[PDB]
Amino acid sequence: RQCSFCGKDILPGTGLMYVRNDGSLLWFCSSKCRKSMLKLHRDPKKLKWTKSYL
Amino acid sequence: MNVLGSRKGFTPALQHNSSVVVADNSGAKEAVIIGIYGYRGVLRRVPFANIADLVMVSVRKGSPDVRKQKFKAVIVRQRMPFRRPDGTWISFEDNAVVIINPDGTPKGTEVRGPIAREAAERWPKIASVATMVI
Amino acid sequence: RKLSSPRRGSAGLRPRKRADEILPTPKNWPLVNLKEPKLLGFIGYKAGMTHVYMIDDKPTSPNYGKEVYTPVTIVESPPILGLALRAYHIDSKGELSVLVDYWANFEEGSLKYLKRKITSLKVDSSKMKEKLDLIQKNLNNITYMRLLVSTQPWLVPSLGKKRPEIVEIQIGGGSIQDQLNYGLSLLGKQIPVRDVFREGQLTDIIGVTKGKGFQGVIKRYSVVEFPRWHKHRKGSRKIGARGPSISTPSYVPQPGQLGFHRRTEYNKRIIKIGDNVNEINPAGGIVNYGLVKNTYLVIEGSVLGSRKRPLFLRYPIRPSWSPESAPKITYVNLASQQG
RNA sequence: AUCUAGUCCGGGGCAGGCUGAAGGUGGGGGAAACCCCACUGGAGGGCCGAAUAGGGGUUCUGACGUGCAAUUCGUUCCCUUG
RNA sequence: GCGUCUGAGGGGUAACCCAGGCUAGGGAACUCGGCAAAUUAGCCCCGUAACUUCGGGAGAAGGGGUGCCUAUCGUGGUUUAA
RNA sequence: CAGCCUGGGGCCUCGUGAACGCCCUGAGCCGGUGCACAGUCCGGCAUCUCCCUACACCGAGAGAAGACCCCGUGGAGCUUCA
RNA sequence: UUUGCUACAUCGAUGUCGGCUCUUCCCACCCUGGAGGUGCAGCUGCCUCCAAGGGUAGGGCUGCCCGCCCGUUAAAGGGGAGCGUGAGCUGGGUUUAGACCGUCGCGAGACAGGUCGGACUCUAAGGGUAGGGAGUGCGGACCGCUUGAGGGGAAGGAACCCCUAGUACGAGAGGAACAGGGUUCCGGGGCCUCCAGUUUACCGGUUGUCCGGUAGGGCAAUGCCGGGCAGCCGCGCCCUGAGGGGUAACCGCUGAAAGCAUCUAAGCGGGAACCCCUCCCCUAAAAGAGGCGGUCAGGCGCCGGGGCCUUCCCCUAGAAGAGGGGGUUGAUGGGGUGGGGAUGUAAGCUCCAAGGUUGUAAGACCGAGGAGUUUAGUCCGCCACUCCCAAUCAGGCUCCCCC
């Protein structure tokens, strides 16, 4: 499955699933992606280490 | 009750005097954990609890007829990450409980928000009124 | 008023001293366990650790027939070299002394790697002919047979050493005469790991743990640090009282050496024995070790010691159950261990 | 009475800001008395504030306690037109 | 003007002590006691309760704004200068 | 319910260079004896010699002719109806 | 283990309440284990005997101790150690000097009544303890492997759930146990794959100022902010049987004294978390000071020689010592080249930029910033290959036994 910030593949047995009060799910490959959505709120379209840059 | 026979034990998320939200329409909104059913510990340690545990709570915020009263509740969501036996880590947005009657049936007729499966397997009456189970 | 709290640490492990050798030998061995002549242990080197996904084997387990996630330790195990044959008897004084050792390297097995540890026998002193007939003369009052084996570290490049380690391993099986015949066939040969163990078995691990130097009492015994003000107040990382009496002021916690102790583990299962190292090596190498290139064992759980630690693997002496073959593995984590 | 207590005589000082008393002027109201607003004015044992500007000596029952020192040092604080 | 608040060197820098930084989940459950530490914080605009000796309370409480760049406008000073 | 990191010490080396404990050097410990809690006495069980770091439980540890209490045909200041 | 009684010891001092920290013991047994009785149907009770191996927790109120109370628990037993422990802390209580109140006193003043404020010194000769190094003995100098007198341990303890079984039992209501499985909590020992913390290695952003501007840097206790590898760590993960012998309380057999009866007197059999062995950790300074394999060439005290250590390159280890390796017959550290990673896409150049300055126009000049070159540039206390560089020189100690 795929990271919700950077879009890359999450190998089994690693990562984190985050559950929000509306029932939606978020997948994170590392803490760097978890912090970049839940804490820093940076957007991924401006970073070219992200699959969403283009 | 029904799924404790597996490895029912996770990260120690909650304690005495920890605050939780009441995820049902019983009337309460916020509570404070007063006792943990079943724990027996060591010198200086505060008893702990995680998902699918029975607790005693005291309602701090809610309707006048339930405020400042003691009830039984089970933990359904927790902020601190915990790992399922298939190796996946789960994490919720807040710590929550649902208030039950002495025989195990929910006091409210509706449950707000998602519920962990370990809470739905151990407490079948709660799973009957829960809409979404994670 | 004098509540109850258990003591800090075990009173049976004192002294917590440094181990006097890096490769310990078991003092006790499992019983015959109704088998035919074979060795009861092997020698390996700890490499690293990863995690696999297997389908559960334990028929009583709650997760039976389901894919569960398990950590594993990787142990590199080249063949060992059989050096000598050793016979024990109850001598006068009624002890368990050694009767004689029968060495055999000259016919084939001329090694100078072996001289980095022992300035071993000259051609002049190859009079081992009459050591063997002493064993056969004094048969029927021999109690144990043991084989001296040698590791071959020169076959492990990540393990930057060439002098070997010498230990002795016990034979358990049929009769004494039957065991003498088996021990003479291994003498001077190379013993693969598959001649001893098989996939699915349980083992006992003996070795030396990671050293940590002189340490305090909060790490050595996990005593409680002084609360509030005392966290601010004249020293907190200590015990208050050192006993009541002048009775040889007693065994209370003190600071000193932590780690590098000889310890033992029970019931560690072997999940796989492999030769194709491309199925175990992660991307970029095992961090701080290197690459596996010999036969390896996949052992589920943890193992005492640091990387490149010699480990003695023994038959289980208080086994919990008796497994069968094939704990099927569906996934192995080959991702990089950096980052 | 070179310390310290009180007094008398002759001297030297208190960075930088704030609030805005009486009094004064101009609008707006109502006959009147008088009221409202804006500005000006610069009072008071008023207020905030400089390690080492000066003065004090509350907390940590902090450091030191055969000291730097027979009373000091650090932090947290108190006063500063009388 | 000084490196003279006049002893230096080595150390993958042990335990521990004196000063300091950060910690997941919980948030006073610690303790005689929230001690210590943390939080807040400058300036402009809006807004400000009970009580009151009518002067105060009051910076009550609370809410919003603030950087950089490119151009402008208004008010005032000064220059032999309405 | 502790963990990791940093400055100055501690640790190893060169130079300078003290103080308190001291009948004695003879001081392992357990049960006793005895002015009633012994390093030294009795009965046992132990015990090869030296050096380094760390800890402060014991030496009724060190430091001060007990401020408490009583006595002395000892004082001093205060009081008054001596 | 209280409170008194006595006045033997200490008045040129044995620091005087409570709490915290840490250790150990008693048994008069609160729970866990065994057996029995009952006004013991079952579940739950009550009582008696053995037994100290393990446990006995979290809070509100008070300086407390006691005590009352809250939610749990298998149970939340009771005592000793100079009322264990201030050269370990604390300083709420108490017993100095300052002050207020009530009562008492002509007064100065008193209370055993209340209240506010009030200092906690020391660098460890000796012993003990926790660890780490040398020496002599066994036994001429060395290399290697072992045994298992002795010693220590709690290394494990407990609860919940499944089935047995809605069964036995009981009118119904209610409602077990043995055998066999799983898990969790408390204790013990370890580890870093996952996750979490840290990460004054490193990468970036940005404020004030200084180095003429850009670029690159100094300072502001990393200036602050964001991310963060290795390592270390817990909030993460792994391991943590039972059996044999001897018994306790007792239960039985055969059996008389005492024709019968009788578990006891002779003579036997069973029987506990107890004790000893199995298991784990230290063990030949065990004086009976153990056993086993190998080296100490050769020539005529000398020549010659073997071994060990420092120096040299290091890390698995490390306070100093020690330990574990490599030393050209070599991959031990560095360099070079690849791999795998951390930040987040360098400087310079080209195009655009809200506007403005010019210029007859064309055009060029300033401009926070945006895009391209560009998964860039910088960095890596990780891995692989490759003799390019360096493991060189030098010094000291001790042996040649048997034949």
From Swiss-Prot, chain A:
One of its GO terms (cellular component) is ribonucleoprotein complex. Its cofactor is Zn(2+). Binds 1 zinc ion per subunit. GO terms for biological process: translation. InterPro entries: L24e/L24_sf, Ribosomal_eL24, Ribosomal_eL24-rel_arc, Ribosomal_eL24-rel_N, Ribosomal_eL24_CS, TRASH_dom. Keywords: Metal-binding, Ribonucleoprotein, Ribosomal protein, RNA-binding, rRNA-binding, Zinc, Zinc-finger. Zn(2+) binds at C3, C6, C29, C33. Gene3D superfamilies: Ribosomal protein L24e. It comes from the Archaea. A zinc finger (C4-type) spans 3-33. GO terms for molecular function: rRNA binding; structural constituent of ribosome; zinc ion binding. SUPFAM superfamilies: Glucocorticoid receptor-like (DNA-binding domain). Coiled coil: none annotated. Belongs to the eukaryotic ribosomal protein eL24 family. Binds to the 23S rRNA. Part of the 50S ribosomal subunit. Forms a cluster with proteins L3 and L14. NCBIfam families: PRK14891.1-1. This is Large ribosomal subunit protein eL24. It comes from Sulfolobus acidocaldarius (strain ATCC 33909 / DSM 639 / JCM 8929 / NBRC 15157 / NCIMB 11770). The gene is rpl24e.
Swiss-Prot record, chain B:
Part of the 50S ribosomal subunit. Forms a cluster with proteins L3 and L24e, part of which may contact the 16S rRNA in 2 intersubunit bridges. The lineage of its organism: Archaea, Thermoproteota, Thermoprotei, Sulfolobales, Sulfolobaceae. GO terms for cellular component: cytosolic large ribosomal subunit. GO terms for molecular function: large ribosomal subunit rRNA binding; structural constituent of ribosome. HAMAP family: Ribosomal_uL14. Pfam families: Ribosomal_L14. Keywords: Ribonucleoprotein, Ribosomal protein, RNA-binding, rRNA-binding. The keyword rRNA-binding applies. The gene is rpl14. InterPro entries: Ribosomal_uL14, Ribosomal_uL14_arc, Ribosomal_uL14_CS, Ribosomal_uL14_sf. The keyword Transferase does not apply. GO terms for biological process: translation. It comes from the Archaea. It comes from Sulfolobus acidocaldarius (strain ATCC 33909 / DSM 639 / JCM 8929 / NBRC 15157 / NCIMB 11770). Signal peptide: none annotated. This is Large ribosomal subunit protein uL14. Belongs to the universal ribosomal protein uL14 family. Binds to 23S rRNA. Forms part of two intersubunit bridges in the 70S ribosome.
UniProtKB/Swiss-Prot annotation, chain C:
InterPro entries: L3_arc_euk, Ribosomal_L3_dom_3_arc_sf, Ribosomal_uL3, Ribosomal_uL3_arc, Ribosomal_uL3_CS, Transl_B-barrel_sf. One of its GO terms (molecular function) is rRNA binding. Keywords: Ribonucleoprotein, Ribosomal protein, RNA-binding, rRNA-binding. The keyword Ribonucleoprotein applies. Signal peptide: none annotated. One of its GO terms (biological process) is translation. One of its GO terms (cellular component) is cytosolic large ribosomal subunit. Pfam families: Ribosomal_L3. Residues 1-19 are annotated as: Disordered. Gene3D superfamilies: 3.30.1430.10, Ribosomal protein L3, domain 3, Translation factors. PROSITE patterns: RIBOSOMAL_L3. Belongs to the universal ribosomal protein uL3 family. Part of the 50S ribosomal subunit. Forms a cluster with proteins L14 and L24e. HAMAP family: Ribosomal_uL3_A. One of the primary rRNA binding proteins, it binds directly near the 3'-end of the 23S rRNA, where it nucleates assembly of the 50S subunit. This is Large ribosomal subunit protein uL3.
